[PDB]
Amino acid sequence: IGIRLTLPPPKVVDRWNEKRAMFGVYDNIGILGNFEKHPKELIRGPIWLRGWKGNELQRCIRKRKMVGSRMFADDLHNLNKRIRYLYKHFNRHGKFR
Amino acid sequence: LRNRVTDRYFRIQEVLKHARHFRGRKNRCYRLAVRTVIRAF
């Protein structure tokens, strides 16, 4: 019974809408534009992870460092608790030493 | 629930079809059917 008895409504995808059609444009902004701009400057997203990557602990540390003062109170409390938990887990748990 | 299993019906039926000629709940309930089907095989 864990199965739907009707076909789901058809999902139509426009492969040639503007977003898909122009996807990838300016990814070579650096090597084709005399390196005035780095391609990572094209990234739109959270201010604390534009052109940067890390595990959950590093992401949380960076978020606290960069926008911690602007965070809501309980969100910041949750982030502090999460950093503490992730520190304990990554530095004290695991199969490997 | 990013990724959920949608085939569980067919996965269950693959065993229940071999269990259909058993006695009692072994022919209906997958938990009991799978044990008796393995023994049968």
Binding site: I3, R4, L5, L7 | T6, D7
Partner: peptide, 26 residues
């Protein structure tokens, strides 16, 4: 509801097979 189409289509195919077995066309 679970997202996806393949399981639903498989179930429709099995329903069609069972329907053909129960009431085969003349």
């Amino acid at each position: 509801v679970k997202k996806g189409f393949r399981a639903a289509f498989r179930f429709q195919k099995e329903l069609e097979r069972q329907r053909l077995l129960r009431c085969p066309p003349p």
